[PDB]
Structures are given as structure tokens and as C-alpha cells.
Amino acid sequence: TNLCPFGEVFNATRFASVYAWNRKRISNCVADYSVLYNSASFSTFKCYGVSPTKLNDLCFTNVYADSFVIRGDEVRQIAPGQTGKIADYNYKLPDDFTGCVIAWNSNNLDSKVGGNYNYLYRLFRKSNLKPFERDISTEIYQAGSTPCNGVEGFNCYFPLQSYGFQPTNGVGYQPYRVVVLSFELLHAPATVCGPK
Amino acid sequence: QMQLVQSGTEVKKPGESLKISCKGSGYGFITYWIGWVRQMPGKGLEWMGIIYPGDSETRYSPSFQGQVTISADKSINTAYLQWSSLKASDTAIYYCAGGSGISTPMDVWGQGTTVTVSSASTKGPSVFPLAPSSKSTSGGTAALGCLVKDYFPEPVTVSWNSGALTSGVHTFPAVLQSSGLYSLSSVVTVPSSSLGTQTYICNVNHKPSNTKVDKKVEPKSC
Amino acid sequence: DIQLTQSPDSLAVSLGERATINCKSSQSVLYSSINKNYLAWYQQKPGQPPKLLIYWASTRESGVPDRFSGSGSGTDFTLTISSLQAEDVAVYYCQQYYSTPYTFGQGTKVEIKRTVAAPSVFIFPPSDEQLKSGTASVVCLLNNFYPREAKVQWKVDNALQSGNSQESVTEQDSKDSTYSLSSTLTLSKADYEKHKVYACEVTHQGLSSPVTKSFNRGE
Ligand SMILES: *[C@@H]1O[C@H](CO)[C@@H](O)[C@H](O)[C@H]1NC(C)=O
């Protein structure tokens, strides 16, 4: 019964916009991390502080699986110590991050003839996100001296822009689905373990 | 499980460019971060840098920043370490190692690529007998040998009696002489009574110079 | 930029005894998120790549025997071999993988310690064949001795020769744990034929008195 449900996180037919990033908590299951790294269908698989090859015989208090969609130019930004639109305003990772940043080209799934515009990103924000911060606010951004009173125009912008995901776009303007496995170990019971 | 396989031995002159390689085979490769370690002759290990093949993210050690270039080709699972212009001081053996993460131990190692940078040209060895003294301890043991002198590059193979004799043999490490040529002596202890009765020959092979030489060592006429 | 200092440099230990190697890190290497020190231990033998023994300061890499164990915390770490085996003669490096740039210790040479054994000394005059080429090599052999430290003094007509000689040493022997050493005195045919007595004086801990073997040119 209790294999860890990475199947439904990775092979999920719907992915989330990066600003409104989805986090699945993993607890009380046995996790076969081999399925993941033996796959030949991944563009990126950069792990930080931990070896995917050596943790299907280790246990942790909580594992988090964060899923979202960005363009290829931006997957480099899903990593400790990065900066830019995505790193600062959408999904930030901490400097001492422990886990795996897994990405793949999804141009076959997340593109349409006239442009798919369902996937969004926060363009403006007064300060950078803290690690694992998630802002879904649609506050009008005040760029200028005069305050906007929820009123959009000169120096007053709607804070979300849409990705223009067309099939004929160059790799890097095409969509990539990302999953970020993160691992914590407290002095509490451990419930996420490998088969060994 | 997976493994890393490096390019073969290099021997270059100062000023020549060089690019050695490290290709990984086995499932679980998308995950591996590939680093380069240098080990100079007789010295310890020195971490040079690491690359991620998937997106060519490259981190250098302070000591090798802009002294070398680590590069990658994810299509053939191959990391590269290259010089634009080799110095004689670059003479070492270069290991590539693999960690399945960044901030991960190096689980997997290459066999090493030996790089020799020297203005020396290929030269075959000269073989001279270390003749056993006729005046030696009559009931005890005598020593005899070969001097394999003035060759380049490394290595040479030294066997005895076409490989028959291995007991009591010591082939010493080559030393680099100030001439830039290597030199080595191979010795063996045998019963002193056997000096009249048994033929002793050392076989020297220097593949680079295509030099196969058999030298007979016998007690000196004098 | 973390720096590691290993100690000792050299370490000699009888068969089946305990060997301990220390790594001092210039800074802590503790990841907060999983309570684990990011410190590894490698074994390297002659003509071989380094082999990973221990990671996270104390976890054994698979297929590593029980007799290897790692320990320590914060900045002071230890690799320990209970029951040193013949096959453990190697150099051992500690490495931090807390932050790039990764860094290694200077290394710790591990020998088998056995009873003192004095060297058998032999001296070889140069070949007639080499003398035609116009150089002369006089070789001194110290055969199967322990420990490795030995003074070799060249004497030419009773004059101590200096800096015209190089030494060369074997790997500790697999069966009897002894070293062998070759001192090679090099001089021009000219300078060879100016002198009569070429001598090789060996001082070693297993010799009550320094042993000399010599020869007179042309005999
Ligand atoms: C679904 O994801 C799993 C990995 O958990 C994998 O085994 C399977 O091949 C995927 N399905 C596809 C590619 O249709």
C-alpha cells in the first residue's frame, strides 16, 4: 500500500505556476529514489548536500516535493545562492539547502498553437522572498512616488506576467516542469525511509 | 552503480595545448558532478574544480582559476580538463572523481591520466650490468643487477631470465636526472654458488622508443 | 575557504595493532538540516586512484570492512584502523565537502612496524661499457632493512662526496615489511679515473657500527 506517492507528483497532468508553487508533504511511506535517477527523461538533476544514490537506505522526519513550471533559461535559477525574477520573487532556496532540483522539457504538454498563457510568474515585489516563501497576492505594485489606490497605469503594474509558451519558441523559452525534493531531520520520529 | 574512464597517458613539450577526458558509463549518470584532482609526483591530492555535465555549471579551486578549463559534453557523458599552454610544472597524474551531488563525497574515481610535460625528446635506455663481486660471502648470497640509464619518457619494464626469475628481485623507482632523462636500477639476490652455473639476463622494454634489450650480467673478468 | 590539517604525517604500526589519524578543520562542517559533518576519508595505494572509505565523518562506504571507523565533531575528526592488516599500507587523506572549494589533508603515510632488520650492503663499480660512453655510475644497494631511515655516505679516496648522488627506495615489501634502497653516485669518466678507492658507508639503527663496502678502480 505505502510506496511514497512520487508517481502522482511527477506524472501529475496539471503543474502549478511558479509564484503559486505546489508543495506536497511526504510522510509515513517507503520511498524508492532509484525510479528517479535511473530515469533517462530528465534535463537536470542537481542535488545539494545529499546523494540520491545513498538515501534509499536513510530516514528523515519530513520530505517536501515542490512542483511548478518555468522556462529553460530559468531552471539554473532554482538553486541555492541564485538571483533574478524566479529566485527572488517566485521560489527561493536557502543557502544551506539539502535536496534535489529535477527538471525536464515539457514543450509537448505545456505549449499551444496561439501560445499557452496559463503559467504565470511574479514580475515585481517590494522585497525578495525568504527561502520557501510563497506569495499569491495580486497587490498592484507601486513603482512611482504617487501611491496607486488599487488603480493600474503609469508606474503602477499588475504584479503577475504570463509565459508565452508557443511550440516554435527556442529551447529556454519553452516550458520545463521542475520538482524540488527537500529533506529535514529533527529529534522527532522519522517516517520517510528507503527499502533498505 | 557506475564508473569513470579517462584518456590515456600524455607526453607533451612546454607550450603545447592539451585536453584530457573522463567519460562515465552506467545508469544513474544525470545525477553525477565530475571533479578533477591533481597529484604531482610524490605529493598528495589537490582538488582543481568540479563541473555538472547537465548545464556546465563549473566551480574552480582558487589555485587553478584561469590556469585550466573544465568543460563538459552531456551527450556523451564526458567531462574535459584542458590547458591552452602547458608548463613543465603541470607534470602530474590527473584523476577525475564523481559525486552524485554537489556537496557530496567523491564515490567513484577514474584510473588517472598521467601527463608528462618535458622539453626532453623520446630516448631509449642504455642498459649496463651491475656485475656481482667475485669476492663475496661464499656460503651466503650475492647481488647483481642492471642499470637502465638515460631514457624518456616513463615507463620501462625490467624482467629477469625472460620472466622466469622474480624471487629476490627489486626494480627501484625511476629518478628524473637533471638532464631531464630518467634512470632506474633493477637488482636481484641469488645464491653465490649459482654464479658459475646459472645465466642471469635482464630484459628491458621501452615501448615509446621501440627498444627491446637483453643484457647478460656475469662476474667481471677484471 | 576551509583548510584541513592531518596528523601525523607518518605512522608505523605493528600487524593487528590500532592506527589513529587526526583531521583538524579550520572551520565547522556541520549541515544544520541533517545533523551530519561533511568530512570524508580516502585510502590511496601506490599506482591506484584514491578509494572512498568513510563519508559524513563516520558512515562506512559499502564494501568497507568493520575495522575502519570514523569519528569526531565540529572541527576535530579521527579515522581509526583496529587490527592493521598488510593490505592497509597506504596513504590516507581527509577531505571536506561542506563547501566548494573542496579541500584534502596533506595525507598520512601508514607503514607496517616490524622488528629492526639491518641492511645487506653491496657496491657495484661502473661497467666498462658505460665508461666508453664517458660517464660512470657507482651503485650502492641496501637490501631488505627496517626501518626506512638510513644514512648513506659516499667516500672517494676517503673524501666525503656530496650532491652528485640520488637515493631510491622500494615500497614496503608485501611479505617481510622491509625496504630496499639504491644510492647512485654519478661522475664523468675523467673524474672517475682520478681516484682509486670508491666506498659506501651505511649507518642504520640495526647496525651497532656503520658498515662500509668499497672497491679499488680496476679489479
Ligand atoms: C511516471 O513516473 C514514473 C516515475 O515515478 C515512471 O516510472 C513512469 O515511466 C512515468 N510515466 C510515463 C513516462 O509515462
JSON list of N, CA and C and ligand atoms in Angstrom, two decimals, chain A residues 6-8 10-11 35-36 41-42, ligand 1:
[
{"chain": "A", "resi": 6, "resn": "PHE", "atom": "N", "xyz": [5.38, 9.66, -5.15]},
{"chain": "A", "resi": 6, "resn": "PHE", "atom": "CA", "xyz": [6.16, 10.49, -6.11]},
{"chain": "A", "resi": 6, "resn": "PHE", "atom": "C", "xyz": [5.51, 10.35, -7.50]},
{"chain": "A", "resi": 7, "resn": "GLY", "atom": "N", "xyz": [4.87, 9.21, -7.78]},
{"chain": "A", "resi": 7, "resn": "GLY", "atom": "CA", "xyz": [4.18, 8.93, -9.06]},
{"chain": "A", "resi": 7, "resn": "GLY", "atom": "C", "xyz": [3.22, 10.05, -9.41]},
{"chain": "A", "resi": 8, "resn": "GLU", "atom": "N", "xyz": [2.37, 10.41, -8.46]},
{"chain": "A", "resi": 8, "resn": "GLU", "atom": "CA", "xyz": [1.28, 11.41, -8.65]},
{"chain": "A", "resi": 8, "resn": "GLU", "atom": "C", "xyz": [1.85, 12.84, -8.59]},
{"chain": "A", "resi": 10, "resn": "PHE", "atom": "N", "xyz": [5.09, 13.73, -9.95]},
{"chain": "A", "resi": 10, "resn": "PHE", "atom": "CA", "xyz": [5.93, 13.82, -11.17]},
{"chain": "A", "resi": 10, "resn": "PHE", "atom": "C", "xyz": [5.05, 13.63, -12.41]},
{"chain": "A", "resi": 11, "resn": "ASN", "atom": "N", "xyz": [4.16, 12.63, -12.39]},
{"chain": "A", "resi": 11, "resn": "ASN", "atom": "CA", "xyz": [3.32, 12.24, -13.56]},
{"chain": "A", "resi": 11, "resn": "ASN", "atom": "C", "xyz": [1.94, 12.92, -13.42]},
{"chain": "A", "resi": 35, "resn": "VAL", "atom": "N", "xyz": [13.83, 4.90, -8.88]},
{"chain": "A", "resi": 35, "resn": "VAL", "atom": "CA", "xyz": [12.87, 5.20, -10.00]},
{"chain": "A", "resi": 35, "resn": "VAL", "atom": "C", "xyz": [13.30, 6.53, -10.63]},
{"chain": "A", "resi": 36, "resn": "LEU", "atom": "N", "xyz": [13.72, 7.46, -9.77]},
{"chain": "A", "resi": 36, "resn": "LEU", "atom": "CA", "xyz": [14.02, 8.87, -10.16]},
{"chain": "A", "resi": 36, "resn": "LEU", "atom": "C", "xyz": [15.32, 8.95, -10.97]},
{"chain": "A", "resi": 41, "resn": "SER", "atom": "N", "xyz": [14.89, 10.53, -18.67]},
{"chain": "A", "resi": 41, "resn": "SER", "atom": "CA", "xyz": [13.92, 11.53, -19.20]},
{"chain": "A", "resi": 41, "resn": "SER", "atom": "C", "xyz": [14.05, 12.87, -18.46]},
{"chain": "A", "resi": 42, "resn": "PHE", "atom": "N", "xyz": [15.18, 13.15, -17.81]},
{"chain": "A", "resi": 42, "resn": "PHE", "atom": "CA", "xyz": [15.37, 14.38, -17.01]},
{"chain": "A", "resi": 42, "resn": "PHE", "atom": "C", "xyz": [16.49, 15.24, -17.60]},
{"chain": "D", "resi": 1, "resn": "LIG", "atom": "C1", "xyz": [5.68, 8.07, -14.43]},
{"chain": "D", "resi": 1, "resn": "LIG", "atom": "O1", "xyz": [6.60, 8.43, -13.43]},
{"chain": "D", "resi": 1, "resn": "LIG", "atom": "C2", "xyz": [7.22, 7.24, -13.02]},
{"chain": "D", "resi": 1, "resn": "LIG", "atom": "C3", "xyz": [8.26, 7.77, -12.05]},
{"chain": "D", "resi": 1, "resn": "LIG", "atom": "O2", "xyz": [7.69, 7.83, -10.74]},
{"chain": "D", "resi": 1, "resn": "LIG", "atom": "C4", "xyz": [7.83, 6.43, -14.20]},
{"chain": "D", "resi": 1, "resn": "LIG", "atom": "O3", "xyz": [8.19, 5.10, -13.76]},
{"chain": "D", "resi": 1, "resn": "LIG", "atom": "C5", "xyz": [6.96, 6.34, -15.47]},
{"chain": "D", "resi": 1, "resn": "LIG", "atom": "O4", "xyz": [7.75, 5.94, -16.60]},
{"chain": "D", "resi": 1, "resn": "LIG", "atom": "C6", "xyz": [6.27, 7.67, -15.76]},
{"chain": "D", "resi": 1, "resn": "LIG", "atom": "N1", "xyz": [5.26, 7.53, -16.80]},
{"chain": "D", "resi": 1, "resn": "LIG", "atom": "C7", "xyz": [5.43, 7.87, -18.09]},
{"chain": "D", "resi": 1, "resn": "LIG", "atom": "C8", "xyz": [6.77, 8.38, -18.56]},
{"chain": "D", "resi": 1, "resn": "LIG", "atom": "O5", "xyz": [4.51, 7.78, -18.90]}
]
